[PDB]
């Protein structure tokens, strides 16, 4: 038996596995239970901590994926399948993973905690693109990732009730982070240097832990990739949460919050999943049925208010976006869009798409959108209309929420670093008109190009090694810059400096789509209030 | 005596005067009465035709200027004085002027009719910059210009009343146009080829005669320089016109519409002038107290509405703007602005000037303006704020009203030619930061640079000759282009082509500030409706 692969945590004994990486071995502890299985009576309830165990738990493979909708848009296509569950669906899914250097470290080592995205309705820590062996070998960090409940199981809310309080998926994340505090030192990690990082709904989750004091004590630095808690899709108010929950109950035959929830627990998990997308109020893209709710508990106020009122002195943050944030969303419901043609839309299709991409705003608001994104010297040109809609959806849902957060955090005490990710993977299977889509920087951060069985160029492998170095430098020191050596300047509300990440060296640019984001972050809220 | 200078018109006999130009003489008939003096009980009433006279009317000098406010902003400054009255003020001011080649054409000559600008509150046909001797000698047209009542005398309106109906200054213009129909042949002019042309409020007047059927039979072609009848300053509604007339009465000590106008008719003219600016509802620039009223008579509906519903087949129109339409207005009440320093305003001055330059709009509409005119990469930069506010005032009041008129007329059967005048006169006395200000193309249209006592360059004189040729070509044929010879394309709603007028040959461009005018012409009305 290998004693490097044996670890005891507060719950009992764990056995792990030695993983092989191109650069050397890595210890991996995959599928560590951290909660009691949230099944039967425990469906929709906050997670309870895992009760201690006798013997040795084999933590040698990824455990099950939390129940979730499975994308069927382009069946068998690499671009959609890479995000789909690669383990059995189950409600017994609250397990986390630890990767640590081999042999395990002797000096307390900085920890990176990954939170996957997937719109709060999908995702898993077992996806090939979140493999943590490459980052742990190259940068000698400890890496943790967890599963958390998604869809109705994680975020269905009857606000006020005991039986479905909402936000339990965020409580899964919080419990995983408490486990890191009590136990990561057993793997050689340092619980006083913990960096959260996540992408899309994971980035929004990282942001909500920033704004929730019981979580804020569990980490020290944050990375938000292509997401923010103030995004128009990442939260919902108490009333709309109850309307959606009640419509789901009605659609699956269920009738007092206690009795409605009790009838919901008798339904098969798949029956809930099959009716998830039917509770959305309007035809839309980038809108999800069950998301965090503002109930005054995890979030005291809306994220926009908590951001504006926060003191962030002592925090370091790294934030960024990809170059084409909204392209991927259009093939999921905007008129005239396909991955299999050039999606050169007409003007009527553009106007129609604006209401799908900016759902639940007034006709006047929609007209201000059409004003700002039409080129009035070329109002009919299909190629311009295509990127215009892509920019609408990307600015509204990602770029401008992120820029608002970065700007407030910097002005209110935090050190912020910002990037735009601009390299299109040579292996990307989506059409060329989509540019660099939402989610395609993650493989480079996790060093997936260093896997030999994949067919990345040698330059992409060097780029991966640069990006892992920035991320781990930030995790270690709060600063992505190489301690003794092209500098990455802090982002500030005045100068608004950020860097481009591609095969070329760092180039400093100014303004995260500043004219566009002035519309979304300043004017549109005022129009909605009048 | 000279038989060339004796002319008989319907009302009697006139004696003219020979005038010299560097290219030869010109016959001038100045101060021809075309209406009964609108004095005493005729104040505020429509003009009525001049009764015939015996003997010979002396037509060798300009007659009086209609009572008007005299600009005292920079006393003795050439830039302001060139627009101030250069004859005595009198209510007895309804005279017109005819300039014709010497000796008089014996065959019908196309007629240009000039309507002066001045905000409907000022102006005079005798100003040096409107001297018709140069256009008449070089282009061999007949030039007519007339005085019309301004300020309260021309546009004070108690709508529906018999004693102050409104729009009588426009009726003075119509009467002069009828005079031209009946009498211009006596000078060699062809009453079947009359081109109206005007600048600023004169351009708005031209547009108003386009949209009024009783006027529309008195001319055939139209030139609108830096003005349009749909300008936010060019008309007032009945309610606000009544409010303004009522407050003027109060401010001059007057108390029933009949009783109110009677007391105003007892007041010296200069008394009415002294209180004119005080009836304006808000602190403003480019806003005038007594302007045309929409009452259902001269204008059946608002000009914007009559434009959208018109059949303009058969109409040729020449329209254009100067390069910096708003600069001049800022020295009359925008915070931080002076002709004597660089007017490098601060952000707070910029925000306050938006409310003076866009008066009487909601705060939400003002935010929208600040959105679109701030550079969010440089929100504090004084030079950028100076130009931005100049663009706000110029786009709101001139460029975008003019672009709307051009697009509607073109798309509804008119043949439209559009220009931007981009030459800054070498003799200009205003500071360099105002660029090419409002009004400073007129002197080139009238060929003032040909006068040797003025200090224009040689190739400014050539420029002037080019523009006189364009204007006169258009008067003769509806097309400014040289009939047998760099082509000036028509402006269309699609291609939006226009030319730049400067010392360089014609350069064709696309779109009169198309992005900015989408805001003012498309979005901002929808915002004010909700
Ligand atoms: C681009 O494709 C979309 C989507 O059409 C689907 O994918 C195509 C590759 C082809 O296989 C179609 O048959 C598929 O339905 C086109 O938009 C569709 O157009 C059809 C008319 O043929 C219409 O019935 C659908 O409702 C449209 N779908 C959407 C989402 O709008 C679009 O016209 C194509 N653009 C081109 C060819 O330029
Ligand atoms: C540019 O000048 C304006 C106008 O000030 C007037 O003209 C100047 C040339 C000078 O003679 C001033 O004394 C005149 O009053 C300045 O704006 C004024 O600033 C003063 C303060 O000194 C203030 O009392 C006035 O209210 C301001 N007037 C307006 C219309 O805002 C402006 O500051 C000057 N810009 C500079 C110097 O950059
Ligand atoms: C069934 O109906 C609908 C399904 C979807 C929508 C709308 C629907 O109906 C209106 C959407 O908007 C789709 C949103 C997507 F995000 C698009 C791209 N990701 C990839 C990805 C990126 C980053 C990740 F971290 C994880 C995954 C997949 C889903 C799904
Ligand atoms: C006393 O108070 C005020 C006085 C004025 C305003 C506001 C006032 O108080 C709020 C203004 O907006 C001024 C507007 C101006 F048009 C600017 C341009 N010049 C030259 C010019 C150009 C073209 C012409 F055809 C004729 C003349 C005339 C004055 C006057």
**Could you please report the per-residue DSSP string of A432-498?**
GGG-S-TT-SHHHHTTGGG-TTS---HHHHHHHHHHHHHHHHHHHHS--S-S-----PPB-TTT-EE
Residues ≥6 apart with Cβ < 8 Å to A25: A18, A19, A102, A137
- Which of the ligands is closest to the CA of residue B84? 4
Distances (CA, A) of A140 to A107, A258, B359: 11, 49, 64
Measured in Å, residue A397 CA sits from the centre of ligand 1 at 25
Q: Which of A371, A510, A530 sits opposite B518 (nearest CB)?
A: A371
| Residue that has been written with the tokens 């008089």 in this structure | B104
| Residue that has been written with the tokens 């092989």 in this structure | A20
Using CA atoms, how far apart are residues A475 and A473, in angstroms rounded to an integer? Answer: 5
Residues of A in contact with B374 (CB under 8 A): 518
Q: Which of B372, B400, B407, B491 to mutate against chain A (most A CBs within 10 Å)?
A: B372
Q: Which of B368, B376, B514 sits opposite A376 (nearest CB)?
A: B514
Tell whether ligand 1 has an atom less than 6 A from the beta carbon of residue A344.
yes
Return the percent helix, strand and coil in chain A, to nearest 5.
Answer: 40, 20, 45
Question: Do B367 and A496 lie within an 8 Å CB cutoff?
Answer: no
Strands of A507-510's sheet, edge to edge? A17-21, A24-33, A95-101, A142-146, A109-115, A189-199, A221-225, A316-322, A415-421, A497-501, A507-510
- SS3 labels along A99-117: EEECCCCCCCEEEEEEECC
Tokens (6 digits) for B194: 């009359």
Tell whether ligand 2 has an atom less than 6 A from the beta carbon of residue B338.
yes
Question: Residues near ligand 3 with C-beta < 6 Å?
Answer: A 71, 83, 117-119, 123, 199-200, 277, 284-286, 328-329, 332-333, 438-439
| Residue that has been written with the tokens 């200078």 in this structure | B5
Closest-CA residue of A relative to B528 is A364
Question: Do B523 and A371 lie within an 8 Å CB cutoff?
Answer: yes
SS3 of residue A317 by DSSP: strand
Which of A10, A13, A9, A5 lies closest to A55, judged by CA? A13
Backbone angles phi, psi at B145, to 5 degrees: -140, 155
Which of B120, B112, B122 lies closest to B184, judged by CA? B112
Closest-CA residue of A relative to B369 is A523
Question: Do A368 and B523 lie within an 8 Å CB cutoff?
Answer: yes
Ligand 1 pocket: which of A335, A341, A381 to mutate (most atoms within 8 A of CB): A341
Q: Are strands B6-9 and B17-21 parallel, antiparallel or unpaired?
A: unpaired
Using CA atoms, how far apart are residues A193 and B133, in angstroms rounded to an integer? Answer: 87
Radius of gyration, CA atoms only, chain A: 22
Using CA atoms, how far apart are residues A377 and A371, in angstroms rounded to an integer? Answer: 12
Ligand 3 pocket: which of A332, A357, A425, A442 to mutate (most atoms within 8 A of CB): A332
Q: Are strands A189-199 and A221-225 parallel, antiparallel or unpaired?
A: parallel
Distance of CA B272 to the CA centre of its chain: 23
Strands of A12-15's sheet, edge to edge? A6-9, A12-15, A56-58
Which of B126, B183, B167, B151 lies closest to B271, judged by CA? B151
- Which of the ligands is closest to the CA of residue A385? 1
Measured in Å, residue B338 CA sits from the centre of ligand 4 at 14
Using CA atoms, how far apart are residues B505 and A327, in angstroms rounded to an integer? Answer: 45
Tally of residues, chain B: 530
- Inter-chain Cβ pairs, chain A and chain B, closer than 8 A: 47
How close is the nearest chain B Cα to the Cα of A462, in Å?
33
Using CA atoms, how far apart are residues B486 and B506, in angstroms rounded to an integer? Answer: 6
Protein residue closest via CA to atom 15 of ligand 3? A329
Q: Which of A371, A517, A522 sits opposite B522 (nearest CB)?
A: A371
Using CA atoms, how far apart are residues A520 and A517, in angstroms rounded to an integer? Answer: 5
How close is the nearest chain B Cα to the Cα of A519, in Å?
7
Taking each helix axis from N to C terminus, what angle separates B168-183 and B201-210, rounded to the nearest 10 degrees? 70
Using CA atoms, how far apart are residues B225 and B26, in angstroms rounded to an integer? Answer: 26
| Residue that has been written with the tokens 């002076």 in this structure | B338
Radius of gyration, CA atoms only, chain B: 22
What DSSP character marks residue B216? H
Q: Are strands B95-101 and B17-21 parallel, antiparallel or unpaired?
A: unpaired
Closest-CA residue of A relative to B380 is A494
Using CA atoms, how far apart are residues B322 and A294, in angstroms rounded to an integer? Answer: 54
Using CA atoms, how far apart are residues B108 and B184, in angstroms rounded to an integer? Answer: 10
Measured in Å, residue B167 CA sits from the centre of ligand 4 at 20
Residues of B in contact with A364 (CB under 8 A): 526-527, 530
Protein residue closest via CA to atom 4 of ligand 2? B338
Distances (CA, A) of B406 to A30, A306, B85, B260: 71, 50, 32, 41
Strands of B6-9's sheet, edge to edge? B6-9, B12-15, B56-58
Closest-CA residue of A relative to B527 is A364
- SS3 labels along B131-194: CCHHHHHHHCCEEEEECCCCHHHHHCCCCCCCCCCCCHHHHHHHHHHHHHHHHHHHHCEEEEEE
Tell whether ligand 1 has an atom less than 6 A from the beta carbon of residue A340.
yes
- Which of the ligands is closest to the CA of residue A339? 1
Neighbour-count burial for B265-302, b at 16+ CB within 10 Å, e otherwise: bebebeebbebbeebeeeebbbbbbbbbbbbeebbeee
Ligand 4 pocket: which of B438, B444, B446 to mutate (most atoms within 8 A of CB): B438
Residues ≥6 apart with Cβ < 8 Å to A19: A25, A26, A27, A28, A99, A133
Q: Is A209 a catalytic residue?
A: no
Question: Do A377 and B530 lie within an 8 Å CB cutoff?
Answer: no
Give the sign of the dihedral formed by CA B300, CA B302, CA B307, CA B309. Answer: negative
What DSSP character marks residue A368? H
Q: How many alpha carbons fall within 13 Å on the CB side of residue A81?
A: 6
Question: Do B364 and A496 lie within an 8 Å CB cutoff?
Answer: no
Residues of B in contact with A388 (CB under 8 A): none
Using CA atoms, how far apart are residues B329 and B326, in angstroms rounded to an integer? Answer: 6
Largest alpha-carbon pair distance within chain B?
Answer: 73
In DSSP terms, B376 is beta-bridged to none
Give the sign of the dihedral formed by CA B515, CA B518, CA B521, CA B523. Answer: negative
Are A223 and A199 in contact by the 8 Å Cβ rule? The answer is: no
Neighbour-count burial for B64-86, b at 16+ CB within 10 Å, e otherwise: bbbbbbebeebeeeebbeebebe
Question: Do A364 and B527 lie within an 8 Å CB cutoff?
Answer: yes
Q: Which of A364, A374, A511 sits opposite B530 (nearest CB)?
A: A364
Question: Do A376 and B510 lie within an 8 Å CB cutoff?
Answer: no
Residues of B in contact with A367 (CB under 8 A): 522-523, 526
Number of separate helices (H) and strands (E) present in chain A:
19, 18
Read out DSSP for B408-444?
Answer: HHHHTT-EEEEEEE-PPPTT--S-GGG-SBTTTTHHH
In DSSP terms, A101 is beta-bridged to A26
Which of A192, A80, A98 lies closest to A142, judged by CA? A98
In DSSP terms, B44 is beta-bridged to none
Distance of CA B294 to the CA centre of its chain: 19
Protein residue closest via CA to atom 14 of ligand 2? B338
Which of A306, A117, A319 lies closest to A208, judged by CA? A306
In DSSP terms, A111 is beta-bridged to A142, A194
Q: Is A91 a catalytic residue?
A: no
Closest-CA residue of B relative to A363 is B526
Strands of B415-421's sheet, edge to edge? B17-21, B24-33, B95-101, B142-146, B109-115, B189-199, B221-225, B316-322, B415-421, B497-501, B507-510
Distances (CA, A) of A474 to A99, A408, A502, B143: 19, 20, 18, 78
Using CA atoms, how far apart are residues B219 and B228, in angstroms rounded to an integer? Answer: 17
Protein residue closest via CA to atom 16 of ligand 2? B336
Q: How many alpha carbons fall within 13 Å on the CB side of residue A20?
A: 2
Q: Which of B367, B510, B526 sits opposite A377 (nearest CB)?
A: B510
Are A142 and A475 in contact by the 8 Å Cβ rule? The answer is: no
Largest alpha-carbon pair distance within chain A?
Answer: 73
User: Exposed, middle or buried, B405 (CB in 10 Å: 0-12/13-18/19+)?
Assistant: buried
Using CA atoms, how far apart are residues A94 and A43, in angstroms rounded to an integer? Answer: 12
Protein residue closest via CA to atom 29 of ligand 3? A118
Which of A171, A232, A227, A155 lies closest to A197, judged by CA? A227
Tokens (6 digits) for B318: 């020449």
Which of A390, A385, A324 lies closest to A357, judged by CA? A390
In DSSP terms, A100 is beta-bridged to A27
Q: Which of B374, B377, B530 sits opposite A510 (nearest CB)?
A: B377
Which of B144, B146, B190 lies closest to B34, judged by CA? B146
Which of A383, A166, A137 lies closest to A261, judged by CA? A166
Measured in Å, residue B349 CA sits from the centre of ligand 2 at 12
What DSSP character marks residue B47? P
CA dihedral A261, A263, A264, A265 (to 10 degrees): 90
Tokens (6 digits) for B272: 């009415």
Are A154 and A290 in contact by the 8 Å Cβ rule? The answer is: yes
Q: DSSP E strands: which ranges in A278-327?
A: 293-294, 316-322
Return the percent helix, strand and coil in chain B, to nearest 5.
Answer: 40, 20, 45
Distances (CA, A) of B75 to A436, B64, B275, B329: 63, 22, 20, 17
Using CA atoms, how far apart are residues A476 and A109, in angstroms rounded to an integer? Answer: 9
Residues of A in contact with B368 (CB under 8 A): 523
Residues of B in contact with A510 (CB under 8 A): 377
The annotation status of A119 as a binding-site residue, yes or no, is yes
Residues of A in contact with B364 (CB under 8 A): 526-527, 530
Using CA atoms, how far apart are residues A332 and B101, in angstroms rounded to an integer? Answer: 74
Q: Which of A395, A518, A525 to mutate against chain B (most B CBs within 10 Å)?
A: A518
Tokens (6 digits) for B131: 């001297």
Tokens (6 digits) for B485: 């010879």
Q: DSSP E strands: which ranges in B205-265?
A: 221-225
Residues ≥6 apart with Cβ < 8 Å to A495: A489, A510
User: H-helix or E-strand containing B242?
Assistant: helix B238-251
Q: How many alpha carbons fall within 13 Å on the CB side of residue A353?
A: 30
Are A147 and A124 in contact by the 8 Å Cβ rule? The answer is: yes
Read out DSSP for B330-341?
Answer: HTTT-TT--TTS
Using CA atoms, how far apart are residues A299 and A109, in angstroms rounded to an integer? Answer: 31
Using CA atoms, how far apart are residues B104 and B3, in angstroms rounded to an integer? Answer: 10
Taking each helix axis from N to C terminus, what angle separates A347-357 and A363-373, rounded to the nearest 10 degrees? 120
Taking each helix axis from N to C terminus, what angle separates B347-357 and B382-394, rounded to the nearest 10 degrees? 0
SS3 of residue A25 by DSSP: strand
Using CA atoms, how far apart are residues A176 and A145, in angstroms rounded to an integer? Answer: 8
Closest-CA residue of B relative to A526 is B364
Q: DSSP E strands: which ranges in A316-383?
A: 316-322
Tokens (6 digits) for A362: 């007034």
Discontinuities in chain B with C to N beyond 2.5 Å fall right after 255, 485
Tokens (6 digits) for B376: 């969010």
Q: Resolution reached, in Å?
A: 2.5
Read out DSSP for B64-105?
Answer: PBPP-----SSTT-HHHHTTS-SS-B-S---EEEEEEESSPP
Measured in Å, residue B352 CA sits from the centre of ligand 2 at 15
Q: DSSP E strands: which ranges in A295-423?
A: 316-322, 415-421
């Amino acid at each position: 038996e290998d004693a490097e692969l044996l670890v005891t945590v507060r719950g009992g004994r764990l056995r792990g596995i030695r993983l092989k990486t191109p650069g050397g071995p890595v210890s991996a502890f995959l599928g560590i239970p951290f909660a009691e299985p949230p099944m039967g009576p425990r469906r929709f309830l906050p997670p309870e901590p895992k009760q201690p165990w006798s013997g040795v738990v084999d933590a040698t493979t990824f455990q099950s994926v939390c129940y979730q909708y499975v994308d069927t848009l382009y069946p068998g296509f690499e671009g959609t399948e890479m995000w789909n569950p690669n383990r059995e669906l189950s409600e017994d899914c609250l397990y986390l993973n630890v990767w640590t250097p081999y042999p395990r470290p002797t000096s307390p080592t900085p920890v990176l905690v990954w939170i996957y995205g997937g719109g709060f309705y999908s995702g898993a820590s077992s996806l090939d693109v979140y493999d943590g062996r490459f980052l742990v070998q190259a940068e000698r960090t400890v890496l943790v990732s967890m599963n958390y409940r998604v869809g109705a199981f994680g975020f269905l809310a009857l606000p006020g009730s005991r039986e479905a309080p909402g936000n339990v998926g965020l409580l899964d994340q919080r419990l995983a982070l408490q486990w890191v505090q009590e136990n990561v030192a057993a793997f050689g990690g340092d619980p006083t240097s913990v960096t959260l990082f996540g992408e899309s709904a994971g980035a929004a989750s990282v942001g909500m832990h920033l704004l929730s004091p019981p979580s804020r004590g569990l980490f020290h630095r944050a990375v938000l990739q292509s997401g923010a808690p103030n995004g128009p899709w990442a939260t919902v108010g108490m009333g709309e949460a109850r309307r959606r929950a009640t419509q789901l109950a009605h659609l699956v035959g269920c009738p007092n919050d206690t009795e409605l929830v009790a009838c919901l627990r008798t339904r098969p998990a798949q029956v809930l999943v099959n009716h998830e997308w039917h509770v959305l109020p309007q035809e839309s893209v980038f809108r999800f049925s069950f998301v965090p709710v503002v109930d005054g508990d995890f979030l005291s106020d809306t994220p926009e208010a908590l951001i504006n009122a926060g003191d962030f002195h002592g925090l370091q943050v790294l934030v960024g976006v990809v170059k084409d944030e909204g392209s991927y969303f259009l093939v999921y419901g905007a008129p005239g869009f396909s991955k299999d043609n050039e999606s050169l839309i007409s003007r009527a299709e553009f106007l129609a798409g604006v209401r799908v991409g900016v759902p639940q705003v007034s006709d006047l608001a929609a007209e201000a959108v059409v004003l700002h994104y039409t080129d009035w010297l070329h109002p009919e040109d299909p190629a311009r209309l295509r990127e215009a809609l892509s920019d609408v959806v990307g600015d509204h849902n990602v770029v401008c929420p992120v820029a608002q957060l970065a700007g407030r955090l910097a002005a209110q005490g935090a050190r912020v670093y910002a990037y735009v990710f601009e390299h299109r993977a040579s292996t990307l299977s989506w059409p060329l008109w989509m540019g660099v889509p939402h989610g395609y920087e993650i493989e480079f951060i996790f060093g997936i190009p260093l896997d030999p069985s994949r067919n990345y160029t040698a330059e992409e492998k060097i780029f991966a090694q640069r990006l892992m170095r920035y991320w781990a430098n930030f995790a270690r020191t709060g600063d992505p810059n190489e301690p003794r050596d092209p500098q990455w300047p802090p982002y500030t509300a005045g100068a608004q400096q950020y860097v481009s990440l591609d095969l070329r060296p760092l180039e400093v640019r100014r303004g995260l789509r500043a004219q566009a984001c002035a519309f979304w972050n300043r004017f549109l809220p005022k129009l909605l209030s009048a």
